[PDB]
């Protein structure tokens, strides 16, 4: 539900992992303490894949995908591409995308239903995102930022957005995304809210330095929260 862990000593998880409702991706250079946080609470319901994208460990920022599809940038080698075709099931579809804006995580903010992309993206990509992911694509910016990936975490229930955000811009976004939106901070006051955490329906993993009032705001908008083992035997 509301787990916290960290990669090597870095609190931010959304750089290093990509969580959807049907699969999960993790970087390869990890300890056993980071991989056990996912594998214990996901179990064998969704496949957890140790992978790299373009020879890097920043696969949460280079990829973008949801329940139906996964997009990889141009510099992904065909060894890393043919590897992901085997470990992920046949229901997902993977297609390489020719971009000038290579980092697909910071560009595309998407879920199962509605996607927000970078405003400088071209018409050739927007026809491909609606083909592979099967999602209607809307070009829209959070109030002062053009990167919608790092500054807007999105799910099927709700969404956490950038903290320095005006109210009437959230209300125009909420009519567009059709989910309730809360502005807040994560990881003891980091304004980057898309990369500070990952999220889907059953799980939402954040950093270890996330304080106690910040974890309450995250689980409430995403509505992941809902016991006979406790009791007094004196």
């Amino acid at each position: 539900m509301a787990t916290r862990t960290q990669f090597e000593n870095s609190n931010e998880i959304g750089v290093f992992s990509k969580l959807t409702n049907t699969y999960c991706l993790v970087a390869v250079g990890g300890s056993e303490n980071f991989y056990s946080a996912f594998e214990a609470e996901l179990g064998d319901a969704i496949p957890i894949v140790h992978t790299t994208i373009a020879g890097t460990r920043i696969i949460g920022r280079m990829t973008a995908g949801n329940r139906r599809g996964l997009l990889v940038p141009t510099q992904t080698t065909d060894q890393e591409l043919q590897h992901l075709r085997n470990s992920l099931p046949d229901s997902v579809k993977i297609q390489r995308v020719e971009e000038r804006l290579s980092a697909l995580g910071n560009v595309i903010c998407c879920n199962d239903y509605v996607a927000l992309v970078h405003p400088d993206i071209d018409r050739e990509t927007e026809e491909l995102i609606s083909d592979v992911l099967g999602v209607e694509v809307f070009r829209q910016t959070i109030s002062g930022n053009i990167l919608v990936g790092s500054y807007c975490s999105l799910s099927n229930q709700g969404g956490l957005v950038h903290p320095q955000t005006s109210v009437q811009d959230q209300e125009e976004l909420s009519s567009l995304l059709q989910v309730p939106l809360v502005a807040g901070t994560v990881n003891r006051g980091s304004s980057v809210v898309g990369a500070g955490m990952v999220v889907n329906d059953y799980l939402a993993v954040t950093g270890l330095d996330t304080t106690a009032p910040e974890l309450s705001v995250i689980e409430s908008i995403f509505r992941l929260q809902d016991e006979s083992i406790s009791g007094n035997l004196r």
Partner: protein
């Protein structure tokens, strides 16, 4: 259209604060956490003469010792703190001992940390005092005294 009074809760207080460009974390949940000193050392050196009993200003001078209201003035220029963020708040010294060659001073800074946060903190510095000669008053041992 739901839960859209959203907030900015301050970190680890619970209190909702201004959602705009402002401070960060409650102004008192930031007051315990930030350290505005961060560069001021905990140690410096003062040279004096054992035959003159007269303190040395670092360039060439020899301002004498009253340990009050004029010795305090020379001693904060050596404090290595910079004029960057204090401008001053208040300064006093501790009594500890006459013959031990260490002088303790404590001082408050009243600096700035964030874009609009003035904040005052305090700490104490211990100066090891090194003895050497006054060349003006080591001259008297050479019989070339008058000039």
């Amino acid at each position: 259209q739901h839960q859209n009074a959203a907030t900015l809760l301050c970190c680890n207080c619970g209190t909702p604060i201004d959602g705009s460009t402002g401070l960060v974390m409650c102004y008192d949940c930031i007051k315990l956490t930030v350290d505005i000193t961060q560069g001021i050392p905990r140690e410096a050196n003062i040279s004096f003469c054992r035959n003159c009993e007269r303190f040395l200003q670092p360039p060439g001078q020899w301002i004498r010792a009253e340990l009050e209201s004029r010795e305090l003035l020379a001693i904060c220029l050596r404090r290595l703190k910079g004029l960057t963020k204090v401008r001053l708040v208040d300064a006093s010294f501790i009594w500890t001992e006459p013959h031990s060659r260490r002088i303790r001073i404590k001082l408050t800074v009243q600096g700035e940390a964030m874009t609009n946060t003035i904040i005052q903190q305090t700490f104490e510095v211990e100066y090891i005092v090194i003895a050497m000669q006054c060349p003006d008053c080591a001259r008297s041992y050479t019989t070339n005294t008058w000039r």
